[PDB]
């Protein structure tokens, strides 16, 4: 263990992990015929995704990968809960990076807040609001005479 090179060596390994698990919408950034005990691999999620958590897999004890917490997220601003029945018009499954989104109440109602949000921060709406009014008192005093 101190001075290995004084001895014979089978420097080629003979104990291995099985090939790492795949991921949805991502791949092992490393490839080979086998992975020896305690050799790492790293994951990268494919085009339009960010790998959330820890991308590094160990090949740890009991020959299992000990991959740890990891998840491929597609880099769109997926819309959070809206405000007061106020609607995002250009709806998609995944709002695309820098896509200017326009927002409104049902017609004639006294809406509040900004008209738009832009996903230029590609996982968070550049401006945002959590709550705003759709409607108000739209009928004044009449016939005061």
């Amino acid at each position: 263990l101190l001075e290995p090179h004084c001895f014979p060596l089978s420097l080629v390994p003979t104990e291995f992990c099985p090939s790492p698990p795949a991921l949805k919408d991502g791949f092992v950034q490393d490839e080979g015929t086998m992975f020896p005990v305690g050799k790492n691999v790293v994951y990268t999620c494919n085009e339009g995704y960010s790998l959330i958590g820890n991308p590094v897999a160990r090949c740890g004890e009991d020959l299992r990968w000990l991959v740890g917490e990891m998840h491929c997220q597609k880099i769109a601003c997926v819309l959070p809960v809206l405000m007061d029945g106020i609607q995002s018009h250009p709806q998609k499954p995944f709002y695309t990076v820098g896509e200017k989104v326009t927002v409104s109440c049902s017609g004639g109602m006294s809406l509040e807040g900004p008209s738009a949000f832009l996903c230029g921060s590609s996982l968070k709406w550049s401006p945002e609001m959590k709550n705003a009014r759709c409607v108000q008192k739209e009928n004044p005093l009449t016939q005061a005479v």
């Binding site: 001075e3 960010s50 820890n54 590094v56 880099i75 230029g120 590609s122 996982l123 968070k124 550049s126």
Partner: protein, 307 residues
């Protein structure tokens, strides 16, 4: 051959103190050695781009940060952004996942009455990395300028060649890339003890007006005539000190009144200080050996043509 290897950033035993040293080992059939190689948590790069280099109060500093391995591939590490006051205190830490390979942050709306001055962005990787690329922005009360103004002499110093007559360009251009047609110019000359700070005064006479026409004006300070008439510094032997020149340009039919300054006119005994430029200080017999030197004025620029 080469391996590509790393300290895996999570796998360091870590905790409250860093591992400051590591071993690098080879086990060949024929040899082994360790060696205590250092490590640094300064990995890759952080570069910090602010939507302006300047702000006023009631603005938001809208930083974005660019995060890259030493491969210069984007890093995709969660990151935390340390806004520092001018007074050296920390005022915010805000975090975002490096999801693109680029990291926006929430705008950091200027705190309700800020300390004016050079705030700073110590962009810190969260988790293992210390890299702390750092960048700067200044809170100032301002309106944007109408035109650029710039000042250009050949020497940036007063001394033996020119103390009787020091000679300098005042020039101005609109930010739509056209020369300022006509401007009235005042030149202020004041003796200054250092580039750092003073409250010294201007020459009460031998101040200078000039006219800027077709984007340009010329100025000639007879610095002996001013100094020997108004000031203590009667002899050219006396000083390694400074002249503050300040230039106010008012458009002659336009109502905009820009101003600029150069503390970088040294009064100096030995202006042309030197350095080597690219010279390794190691020789080779039988191959002709270069030397390169350069020469620096005070508030340094390269002086140009000097023997």
């Amino acid at each position: 051959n080469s391996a590509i290897l790393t300290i895996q950033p999570k796998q360091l035993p870590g905790g409250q103190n860093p591992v400051s040293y590591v071993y690098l080992e080879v086990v060949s059939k024929h040899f082994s050695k360790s060696k205590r190689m250092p490590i640094t948590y300064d990995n890759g790069f952080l570069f910090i781009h602010t939507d302006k280099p300047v702000y006023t109060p009631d603005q938001s500093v809208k930083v974005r940060v660019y995060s890259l391995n030493d491969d210069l591939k984007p890093a995709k590490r969660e990151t935390v952004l340390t806004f520092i006051d001018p007074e050296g205190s920390e005022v915010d830490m805000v975090e975002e996942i490096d999801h693109i390979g680029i990291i926006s942050f929430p705008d950091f709306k200027i705190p309700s009455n800020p300390r004016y001055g050079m705030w700073t962005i110590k962009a810190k990787y969260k988790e293992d990395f210390s890299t702390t690329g750092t960048a700067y922005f200044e809170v100032k009360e301002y309106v944007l300028p109408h035109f650029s103004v710039s000042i250009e002499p050949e020497y940036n110093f007063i001394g033996y060649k020119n103390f009787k007559n020091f000679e300098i360009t005042i020039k101005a251009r609109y930010f739509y890339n056209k020369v300022v047609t006509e401007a009235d110019v005042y030149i202020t000359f004041g003796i200054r003890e250092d580039l750092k700070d003073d409250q010294k005064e201007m020459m009460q006479t031998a101040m200078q007006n000039t006219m800027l026409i077709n984007g340009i004006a010329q100025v000639t300070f007879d610095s002996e005539t001013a100094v020997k008439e108004l000031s203590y510094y009667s002899l050219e032997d006396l000083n390694n000190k400074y002249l503050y020149i300040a230039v106010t340009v008012i458009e002659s039919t336009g109502g905009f009144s820009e101003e600029a300054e150069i503390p970088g006119i040294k009064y100096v005994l030995s202006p042309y200080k030197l350095n080597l430029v690219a010279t390794p200080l190691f020789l080779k017999p039988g191959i002709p050996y270069p030397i390169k030197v350069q020469v620096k004025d005070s508030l340094d620029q390269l002086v140009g043509g000097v023997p």
